[PDB]
Structure 1
Amino acid sequence: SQDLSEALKEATKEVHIRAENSEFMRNFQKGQVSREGFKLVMASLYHIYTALEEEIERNKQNPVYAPLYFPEELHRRAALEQDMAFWYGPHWQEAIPYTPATQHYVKRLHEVGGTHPELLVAHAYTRYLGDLSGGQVLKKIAQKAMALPSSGEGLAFFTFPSIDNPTKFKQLYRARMNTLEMTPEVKHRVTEEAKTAFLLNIELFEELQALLTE
């Protein structure tokens, strides 16, 4: 049939266009982004990734994910912790927010990681394949807007020190992604979960936009 890496690209091209042009994003690309909303986004990602990576570890030995286990090159938890200490200070752990939409996302992550590990790959895709495609353009909007150092403090999340060429790594990852055992049943559910992952995102951005509009 059709390769998984391309079945997912197709299955999410529509919803990607709705997320890329959601209100919050539309605002971010306008350079209009306060420290307040940015910290909000970063804190939320910290929870999302802490959940995703905690589940990837639980299933790293599992053949439904194993081929994609790249902690040293992809994982964001460590980088996000550095960003949390930078934005929220030393005791950020007891100061960061945990909004409802974020909880919904984390809840789903644990469900998949605990009971539908074969779908776990739909979330690594949505999250990591995305981070290797445009954390370059938005990175620059951020630095400009808030006056952040080229050195990287406060933007650890956006850097990949162990990956030289993200485009090339992304290609490798796609190929590896296509070596996983796939059956109609699984290929169907996996792409379906990727659309859900996008919606959880779109929902999260609508919720943050709401909060910021005091």
Structure 2
Amino acid sequence: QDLSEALKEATKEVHIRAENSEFMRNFQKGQVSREGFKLVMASLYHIYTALEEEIERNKQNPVYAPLYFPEELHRRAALEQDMAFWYGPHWQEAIPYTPATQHYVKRLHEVGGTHPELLVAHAYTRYLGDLSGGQVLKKIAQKAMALPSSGEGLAFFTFPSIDNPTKFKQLYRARMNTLEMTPEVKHRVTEEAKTAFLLNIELFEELQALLT
């Protein structure tokens, strides 16, 4: 089986659980305020910082390199804008760094440092969602919180260097299928993607509790 297909099949169940998390149910209904939203975007700041640092460490590694798309995909600069929007000029000292975020970041460094053949599972889990349900979350955020169409506060959800998310996702999928793939690597990559989803589910369960 192609890796792109293996990953979708492996994560289709946990994806259902993730999109139906209590935090996300509240989001999709429109119940999340500025406070909740600042919490999740600050958490994403740390996650994508760790993820993109590990992507840089491994950019020339053949186990990842075909998926190296900083210009199109990387979120850190965009999140730095959003942090300045939501938290102001001294956001680096203002933003929270929660335990679940720390746990997620810790795994990203373990993977990037010790198991870079699995890094694709983590880039997959975040980026392809950003290019999918991410786009729906963006419209909900705009409506709920009165965020302007011009895009301030929602740079994270904006991909100026991609014309069509759907087309780019097809490209990224075909490119995943180009990675050197053994039964050993494909088994562990699909397992690591399931873990990536759980780390996200646990972040969202934590934030929901912090707010209630």
Q: Do these two structures clear the TM 0.5 threshold for a shared fold by scoring above it? A: yes
**Offset from partner CA, 1:20-78 (integer Å, 9 cap, x none):** 00100000011111000000000000000000000000000000000010000000000
Count of aligned pairs between the two proteins:
212
**Offset from partner CA, 1:147-168 (integer Å, 9 cap, x none):** 1100000000000000001100
CA distance in 2, matches of 1:112, 1:38: 28
**Offset from partner CA, 1:134-184 (integer Å, 9 cap, x none):** 222111111111111000000000000000011001000000110000000
Match of 1:66 in 2: 65
Where do 1:102-141 residues align within 5 Å?
102-141=101-140
Secondary structure of 1:182's partner? coil
The alignment's C-alpha RMSD in Å is 0.5
Match of 1:31 in 2: 30
CA distance in 2, matches of 1:156, 1:66: 25
Bigger mean CA offset, 130-139 vs 13-22: 130-139
Match of 2:85 in 1: 86
State the 1:118 CA deviation.
0.1
State the 1:133 CA deviation.
1.1
State the 1:18 CA deviation.
0.3
State the 1:83 CA deviation.
0.2
State the 1:199 CA deviation.
0.3
Bigger mean CA offset, 137-146 vs 154-163: 137-146
Match of 1:155 in 2: 154
Structure 1 runs of 4+ aligned residues shifted over 6 Å read none
State the 1:17 CA deviation.
0.3
* Counterpart check, 1:200 vs 2:199: yes
Secondary structure of 1:153's partner? coil
CA distance in 2, matches of 1:98, 1:133: 26
Bigger mean CA offset, 44-53 vs 130-139: 130-139
Unaligned regions of 5+ residues in structure 2, if any? none
CA distance in 2, matches of 1:101, 1:57: 23
State the 1:5 CA deviation.
0.1
* TM, length-normalised to structure 2: 0.99
**Offset from partner CA, 1:95-140 (integer Å, 9 cap, x none):** 0000000000000000000000000000000011111112221111
Alignment identity in percent? Answer: 100
State the 1:186 CA deviation.
0.4
CA distance in 2, matches of 1:165, 1:138: 17
CA distance in 2, matches of 1:31, 1:47: 25
